[PDB]
Amino acid sequence: IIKTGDIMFAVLDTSVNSDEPGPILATIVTGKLKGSKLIGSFNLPSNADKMVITFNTMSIPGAEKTISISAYAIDPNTARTALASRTN
Amino acid sequence: KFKKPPINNPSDDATIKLAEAAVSVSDSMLEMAKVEKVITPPSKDNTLTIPNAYNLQARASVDWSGPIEELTARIAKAAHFRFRVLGKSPSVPVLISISTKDESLAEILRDIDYQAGKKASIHVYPNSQVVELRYAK
Amino acid sequence: MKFKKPPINNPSDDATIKLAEAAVSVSDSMLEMAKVEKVITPPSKDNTLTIPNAYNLQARASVDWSGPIEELTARIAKAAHFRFRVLGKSPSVPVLISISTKDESLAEILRDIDYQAGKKASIHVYPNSQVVELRYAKIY
Amino acid sequence: YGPNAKSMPTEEGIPPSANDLLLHVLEGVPPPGSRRLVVSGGDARAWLSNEK
Amino acid sequence: YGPNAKSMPTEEGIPPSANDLLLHVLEGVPPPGSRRLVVSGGDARAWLSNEK
Amino acid sequence: MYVRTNLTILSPGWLASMTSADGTHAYEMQKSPVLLVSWHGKVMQLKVEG
Amino acid sequence: KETALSVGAQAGLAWRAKIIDEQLNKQARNLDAIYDFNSLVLEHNILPPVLLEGRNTLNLADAQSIRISDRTYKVAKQAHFITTPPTWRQYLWMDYVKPEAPNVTLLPKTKAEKEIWCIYTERGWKNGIDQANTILEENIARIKEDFGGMILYRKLLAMNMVSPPYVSHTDLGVTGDGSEIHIDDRVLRITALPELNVNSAEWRAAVAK
Amino acid sequence: DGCCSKMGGINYCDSSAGRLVCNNGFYSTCYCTRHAVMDLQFLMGCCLWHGGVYPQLNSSGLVVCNDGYVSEECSLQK
Amino acid sequence: DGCCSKMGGINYCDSSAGRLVCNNGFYSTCYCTRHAVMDLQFLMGCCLWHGGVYPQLNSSGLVVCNDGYVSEECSLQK
C-alpha cells in the first residue's frame, strides 16, 4: 500500500544511449523498499532539451511476484525531468 | 628496581565490587554445601577391610560386566581359596562391571562389596582359606 | 590550594556498573538464603574426621580449575605420592567442579572438593597406608 | 430454559486478582508481545503491550 | 461411548534406548547418507544427517 | 501386577500405564510387596500380599 | 539525508556491541563464579523450577470491586531434566556481525551537505549505542530473573512450602535379541512435579540470632 | 560546555546516578544520561492530561484526545 | 615471519600435534593443521548460540534463528 504519487530514491547502474530502447534496470536503496529492482525503458523526445525514462516492471525481493506499477524519475538535487548528459 | 602490580588487579570500583560480590557468594555457597553434606565416620562404615593375606597381593588385569558370583569364584580359584555362597540367588541377578589393568585383588574385592551394597556382601577367612558370598534376606 | 577526594581510579564502564548492580543483590539474596538455611537446620559434624590431615601433606598449592575431577585428583595424588583408588562406576553425566583459590592446604583442597561434590562423590584418606580413595555415589 | 430464556440476573462474582504479568514487569522482563517506551526525567522503565 | 461422549484416553510406551547410529559414529564411520562438516580449533569430527 | 485406581503411584514407578476419559488409571508392573501412593498433595505407604 | 542516520546507527551498534562483548569476555572468571548453576542442581540431575514472588498486591476492577492480597508466589517454568548446567553466556553474550558496505549512492557534495551528513551520522551512532545498552539491560534482567527464581524455589523448599520432586528408577537385566543385547537397562522416570502446598498446618518458621 | 571546568577534568559518566565525574573526586553537575533525576516542572504538547493525542487524523482541524475530550486550543480556529 | 627463526628451519608438520617441527629438535610456535588446540575465546556470528541463522528470506529486515528467537542486532532498523 503506497500513497498515490509519492516520492522514493533509487540508483541507476547500467548506462544506455538514447538510440535503441531496451531493458534498463535500477535499484531502490532507501525507504520501505530495500534492494527492490526496477526494469523499464526510455522514450525519444521531440527535441534534445530533456530525456525521461519509463519505469514499469517493479520486482520486490523475498516474494515471488512481479507487480506492474508504472512510474517515472526526476533528477536528484536538481528536481528536473531532464537528463544529465551531452547534447551538442 | 622496577615492580609491576598484578595484571588483573581490580583497579576500578566496578571491578572491586564484582570481585567482592564473587567472594561473598562463593563463601555462602561453600557454607551451605558444608552444612548440607551428609557424612559418616570410618568407625561404622559399611565396607570390607583389606584381608592382607599374602596370596592377595598379586597384580593382574580384569574386564567384566555381569554376574558377580562367577567372577568371584574365578578370583578365588586364582588365589587358591575355597569358594562358597549362602542365600537364595534372586531371579534378577546382581550385575557389576569392573575394568582395571593393574591393582590388588583386595581392592578388587573391596570394589565388589561396595558395588554389591545392600544386595549381598562378602566375607574372607584367611585362617581357613575361604571366601563366602552372603546374600540379603 | 586545589581540592581532591581520596579514591581516584581508571574510568569505569556502564556494563560493569550494571553487572555489579545485579551482583550485589544476588549476593545479598544468597547470604540470606544461607543464613536461614543454617538457622533452620541442625548441623551435625565435620568432614575433617573422615579425611584428617597428616604429615607430608602441607606442601602449598594454588589452583584454577573449571572442569571434571579425574585429572585434578590424579595430579593431586601424584604430588602427594599416594596410592590412587576409585570406587563405583562413573555415571554418564560428568561431575564438574570449579575452584578458584590461592595458597591453601592439601587437606583443605580435598575437603573443599568433597564438599562441592556434595551428594555425588565422596573422598577418603588412609594415611597409614598412604592412599587416597574417591567413590562415586551409589544411585540410579 | 425454554425459547425465551437467558434473562436471569447476573449473580455475584469475585473480582479477578492482579494480572500476572506484573510479576515479570517487576522482575524486569518485559511481557511477550510488547515494545519498549522512552521516558526521561528520572529512573523508571516502561512498556506497552495491550494499549496499557 | 456415543458421538457426543468425550472419550479421550491416552497411551504411553516404554522409552527407547539411544540410537545405534552413534555406534557407527564412535567406531568412526560416518552415517550413511549424511554429509561431512567442518570443525575448527580443536580435535573433533562432525556430521549432519537429519538436522541432527 | 495389574493395578487399577484413580490415584497416582510415586515410589515404585511404572513401565506402562493407561488412562480412561473418566479419569481411571491402570498400571502394569513387576511384583513389589510395598507401594507408595500420592493423593491430595500427600504421600503415604501401603503393603500387599503376594 | 537519511542514509547518514542509517549507517551511523549500524556502525554505532556494531562498535558498541563488540566493545561490550570483549569487555565481558575479558572479565570472565568472576561471572561464572557468581552464576554457579551446577551446585544448585538437585540430586537426580533435575533442574529445579523457578519461583516468582510478589508482595502487597491490589487490583481494582470497578466500583465496589477491589481485591487485595499480601503475598503471592507463582511457578514460572516447571522443573525438567538436564544434561549440563547453563552458563552466563546464553543470557549475557550478544551477537556481533560487522557491517562493511555503506552503499555509496548519496555522497557528500557541498559543504553544508557534508556537515549535516556528519552530524546526522553522529546522532544515529549515539542512538545505536544506547539501543545496544538497553538490550544489555534486558538480558541482565532476564538472567537475574531466572537465578532469583531458582533461589526462591530453594528457600520455599527449605520453608516446607513446595513438595520436592520425586523420581523412580526401574532396572532390567539382560535385554535385546540375538543380534542386539544390553547388559543392564535403567529407566528413570519422574512423577511428582514440585508444587506449592496450601495446607498451612504443616508450615514451619525459623528464627535467627 | 565544560562540565568539569577549573577542575581535574571530565573522567567518566556514572549511570548509577546519570552524573559526570571530574578527575578530582567531586561529582560534576551536568546530566550524562536520560535516566537522571531532573526536576523539570514544565511540559509541552497538546491533548495532555487526557487520553493523549488520538492516533487517527481527521479531515477537519478539530483534534480530540483519546479520552474523548477535545483540545480546543490544539484545534485550529476560524 | 620465520616460524623457526634463528633456528635450523622448518622440517615438516606433525599433524597429531598440528605443529611444525624445526630442523633443530623443537616444535615451532606456529600451527599447520586446523585440527589443533588453539586457545580462542572470542568470535563472531549472527544468530549465535542458537539454531543458527534461519535460511528464510524476508522482504523486510526481520531475521530469526532456528530456535525461533529474533535478533535486532542481526536485523536492521526503520
Side-chain angles (χ1 to χ4, degrees):
Chain A
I1 302 305
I2 266 183
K3 184 177 179 179
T4 305
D6 43 3
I7 314 177
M8 194 104 293
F9 302 95
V11 185
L12 178 57
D13 63 334
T14 57
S15 182
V16 67
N17 188 306
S18 59
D19 53 359
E20 306 298 324
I24 47 190
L25 40 77
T27 305
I28 309 287
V29 290
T30 180
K32 296 294 301 179
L33 294 177
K34 196 275 173 183
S36 304
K37 50 141 305 299
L38 177 48
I39 314 166
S41 59
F42 67 90
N43 77 321
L44 286 183
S46 64
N47 305 329
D49 35 3
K50 52 131 284 188
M51 156 88 148
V52 87
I53 318 296
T54 302
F55 284 151
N56 58 334
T57 306
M58 246 299 303
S59 198
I60 299 181
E64 40 188 6
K65 43 177 175 56
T66 306
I67 55 184
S68 60
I69 155 72
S70 180
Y72 291 155
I74 52 183
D75 193 4
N77 298 126
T78 323
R80 313 189 79 89
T81 59
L83 210 278
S85 283
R86 304 160 294 178
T87 53
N88 48 12
Chain B
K1 34 146 58 180
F2 308 145
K3 149 73 71 178
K4 296 183 178 61
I7 282 79
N8 296 330
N9 287 321
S11 64
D12 182 71
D13 41 10
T15 61
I16 64 188
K17 197 162 306 304
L18 261 329
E20 60 83 17
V23 171
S24 61
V25 60
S26 54
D27 201 326
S28 171
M29 265 196 172
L30 162 136
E31 293 300 330
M32 182 267 303
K34 289 182 171 177
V35 74
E36 204 285 330
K37 188 178 186 64
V38 46
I39 52 190
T40 174
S43 61
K44 49 197 58 53
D45 45 0
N46 240 335
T47 163
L48 166 62
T49 179
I50 301 304
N52 205 330
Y54 163 77
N55 315 28
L56 280 310
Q57 281 72 3
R59 304 307 294 261
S61 181
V62 159
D63 188 11
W64 167 271
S65 311
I68 168 180
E69 53 284 68
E70 162 70 292
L71 186 144
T72 52
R74 296 248 62 179
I75 296 304
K77 180 55 187 59
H80 307 77
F81 283 70
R82 296 98 53 175
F83 180 88
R84 67 133 62 108
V85 294
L86 274 311
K88 274 64 253 177
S89 183
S91 59
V92 39
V94 181
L95 312 177
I96 310 92
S97 53
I98 294 92
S99 178
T100 173
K101 184 61 59 57
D102 188 0
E103 55 86 78
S104 171
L105 307 91
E107 298 179 350
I108 262 181
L109 270 53
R110 167 184 172 92
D111 187 293
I112 284 297
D113 179 69
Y114 174 78
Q115 304 282 35
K118 310 303 181 179
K119 277 112 291 309
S121 297
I122 153 186
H123 289 61
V124 35
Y125 300 89
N127 43 12
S128 61
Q129 341 294 146
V130 76
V131 292
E132 188 275 345
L133 178 62
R134 203 179 306 172
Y135 273 117
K137 306 170 184 176
Chain C
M1 301 61 63
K2 308 174 181 179
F3 304 142
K4 283 178 178 58
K5 289 189 175 184
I8 307 300
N9 313 119
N10 332 118
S12 308
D13 203 359
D14 52 357
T16 63
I17 295 304
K18 303 172 182 305
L19 260 291
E21 157 61 27
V24 51
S25 302
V26 175
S27 55
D28 119 290
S29 303
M30 180 68 61
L31 288 185
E32 186 273 350
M33 152 268 200
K35 177 181 177 184
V36 60
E37 170 70 21
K38 188 180 188 308
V39 303
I40 194 183
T41 187
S44 65
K45 212 154 50 187
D46 188 310
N47 68 335
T48 296
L49 175 58
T50 191
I51 43 184
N53 69 329
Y55 186 65
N56 69 266
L57 212 62
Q58 305 314 116
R60 305 306 289 174
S62 51
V63 313
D64 173 80
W65 196 286
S66 184
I69 67 183
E70 279 58 29
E71 295 180 348
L72 191 70
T73 179
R75 215 65 50 87
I76 295 312
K78 189 258 292 186
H81 301 53
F82 276 14
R83 304 291 143 79
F84 195 99
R85 197 154 65 181
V86 289
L87 252 63
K89 299 292 104 173
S90 178
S92 304
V93 41
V95 175
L96 312 178
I97 297 299
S98 178
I99 294 298
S100 306
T101 64
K102 172 55 201 172
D103 192 4
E104 56 170 305
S105 102
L106 310 182
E108 306 323 297
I109 267 290
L110 297 181
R111 285 155 183 162
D112 284 55
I113 290 301
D114 206 353
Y115 275 133
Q116 192 159 314
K119 210 186 308 302
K120 308 169 186 177
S122 299
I123 303 305
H124 286 51
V125 177
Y126 297 78
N128 49 10
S129 187
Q130 308 175 2
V131 186
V132 287
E133 205 296 314
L134 49 149
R135 54 195 71 175
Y136 293 108
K138 170 52 213 59
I139 202 58
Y140 308 153
Chain D
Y1 284 145
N4 329 120
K6 282 302 174 298
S7 181
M8 317 67 51
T10 64
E11 211 64 26
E12 64 268 14
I14 280 78
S17 294
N19 183 284
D20 314 6
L21 302 186
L22 279 192
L23 317 175
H24 289 302
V25 174
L26 176 144
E27 188 67 22
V29 39
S34 50
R35 78 169 181 267
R36 293 89 43 83
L37 303 174
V38 39
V39 161
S40 303
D43 283 357
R45 302 302 179 276
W47 289 278
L48 179 60
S49 63
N50 292 116
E51 21 292 324
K52 306 170 182 303
Chain E
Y1 315 97
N4 316 133
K6 320 300 295 180
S7 318
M8 39 181 298
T10 55
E11 188 181 29
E12 294 289 342
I14 169 177
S17 64
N19 188 342
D20 41 326
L21 195 74
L22 267 201
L23 310 179
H24 284 296
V25 177
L26 189 62
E27 74 210 24
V29 49
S34 59
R35 70 173 173 273
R36 287 172 285 96
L37 310 184
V38 39
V39 187
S40 300
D43 170 73
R45 301 298 179 276
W47 289 270
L48 180 55
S49 73
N50 313 124
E51 298 77 42
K52 307 184 177 183
Chain F
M1 315 306 119
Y2 297 154
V3 271
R4 186 172 180 267
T5 338
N6 298 330
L7 310 182
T8 313
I9 61 184
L10 210 70
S11 82
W14 48 263
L15 58 149
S17 300
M18 268 302 307
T19 177
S20 66
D22 28 322
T24 303
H25 268 328
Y27 339 89
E28 64 95 354
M29 281 186 49
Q30 210 255 8
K31 44 192 60 177
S32 61
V34 186
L35 228 299
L36 270 294
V37 174
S38 315
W39 70 292
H40 283 15
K42 59 185 64 60
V43 191
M44 32 281 302
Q45 175 271 163
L46 74 164
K47 39 191 176 301
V48 306
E49 184 271 343
Chain G
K1 294 154 56 187
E2 280 61 41
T3 63
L5 298 167
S6 300
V7 303
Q10 281 299 323
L13 167 63
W15 176 91
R16 179 63 195 181
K18 194 187 63 60
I19 295 305
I20 184 186
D21 201 331
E22 60 81 20
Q23 179 59 35
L24 185 151
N25 178 87
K26 184 231 65 59
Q27 184 34 253
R29 285 317 304 263
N30 305 340
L31 184 54
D32 40 290
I34 64 177
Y35 284 2
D36 178 272
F37 281 54
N38 67 334
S39 58
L40 243 48
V41 179
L42 308 184
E43 170 268 356
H44 249 78
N45 309 79
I46 156 72
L47 171 64
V50 31
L51 268 294
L52 313 180
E53 119 87 331
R55 291 183 178 180
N56 190 14
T57 174
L58 164 68
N59 168 34
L60 180 150
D62 50 319
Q64 316 99 16
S65 66
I66 40 180
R67 191 182 200 165
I68 171 183
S69 178
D70 51 332
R71 285 190 181 172
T72 43
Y73 306 111
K74 195 60 60 268
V75 188
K77 316 175 190 304
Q78 192 58 222
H80 67 138
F81 274 138
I82 174 180
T83 97
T84 163
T87 116
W88 43 266
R89 211 265 337 120
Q90 34 279 72
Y91 293 79
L92 278 311
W93 189 288
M94 50 89 51
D95 293 12
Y96 148 68
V97 39
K98 222 195 66 51
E100 297 88 2
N103 195 8
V104 265
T105 74
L106 190 151
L107 280 309
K109 325 292 290 186
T110 173
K111 312 305 143 294
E113 172 180 7
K114 311 180 190 305
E115 271 68 293
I116 64 179
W117 172 77
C118 291
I119 64 179
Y120 282 174
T121 49
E122 159 263 17
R123 52 180 42 84
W125 120 289
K126 298 182 172 299
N127 297 133
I129 296 170
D130 61 61
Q131 188 165 181
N133 183 23
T134 318
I135 298 184
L136 164 82
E137 273 277 356
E138 270 198 4
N139 293 269
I140 295 178
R142 214 175 290 98
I143 180 58
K144 167 64 182 182
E145 154 77 305
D146 277 326
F147 211 167
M150 304 262 290
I151 296 303
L152 261 301
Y153 161 79
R154 163 61 62 92
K155 255 41 249 163
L156 280 182
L157 177 57
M159 202 178 295
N160 185 20
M161 303 307 179
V162 279
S163 66
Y166 207 99
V167 69
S168 169
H169 40 49
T170 62
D171 59 328
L172 316 175
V174 296
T175 165
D177 77 321
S179 177
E180 313 295 297
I181 202 61
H182 331 78
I183 296 305
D184 46 332
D185 189 8
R186 329 297 308 280
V187 174
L188 267 293
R189 178 176 299 274
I190 78 182
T191 47
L193 317 177
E195 84 301 330
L196 320 148
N197 40 52
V198 301
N199 307 337
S200 55
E202 312 84 312
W203 291 11
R204 188 64 168 178
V207 35
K209 224 297 297 300
Chain H
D1 66 329
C3 300
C4 292
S5 177
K6 300 268 292 303
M7 284 190 164
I10 289 87
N11 183 16
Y12 70 100
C13 165
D14 186 357
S15 298
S16 62
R19 279 303 197 98
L20 293 172
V21 178
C22 306
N23 288 125
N24 38 315
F26 283 76
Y27 277 160
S28 174
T29 191
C30 289
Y31 298 130
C32 66
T33 303
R34 47 166 34 82
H35 295 308
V37 184
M38 306 169 62
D39 7 324
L40 56 148
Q41 309 310 132
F42 186 90
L43 281 95
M44 312 168 187
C46 91
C47 262
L48 179 57
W49 289 351
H50 288 278
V53 177
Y54 200 93
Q56 103 92 12
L57 59 97
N58 194 332
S59 61
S60 64
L62 196 64
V63 48
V64 54
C65 323
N66 291 276
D67 66 336
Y69 189 71
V70 43
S71 183
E72 174 175 352
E73 66 285 53
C74 205
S75 298
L76 41 81
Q77 19 76 3
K78 166 61 191 58
Chain I
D1 198 11
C3 288
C4 296
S5 178
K6 297 295 183 181
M7 286 191 168
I10 318 292
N11 188 14
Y12 60 87
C13 156
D14 186 312
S15 305
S16 63
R19 296 271 220 94
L20 308 178
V21 287
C22 299
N23 295 346
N24 46 324
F26 286 99
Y27 297 171
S28 172
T29 52
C30 298
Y31 325 107
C32 41
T33 81
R34 306 191 301 106
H35 294 190
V37 273
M38 278 63 62
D39 181 57
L40 54 149
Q41 309 307 129
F42 168 73
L43 36 79
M44 304 164 297
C46 151
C47 269
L48 199 63
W49 293 98
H50 291 275
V53 184
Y54 197 78
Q56 73 99 12
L57 78 172
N58 176 226
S59 60
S60 65
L62 178 58
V63 58
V64 81
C65 321
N66 309 22
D67 71 331
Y69 177 51
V70 300
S71 170
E72 303 81 351
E73 335 80 295
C74 191
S75 175
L76 44 80
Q77 248 292 343
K78 44 88 177 181

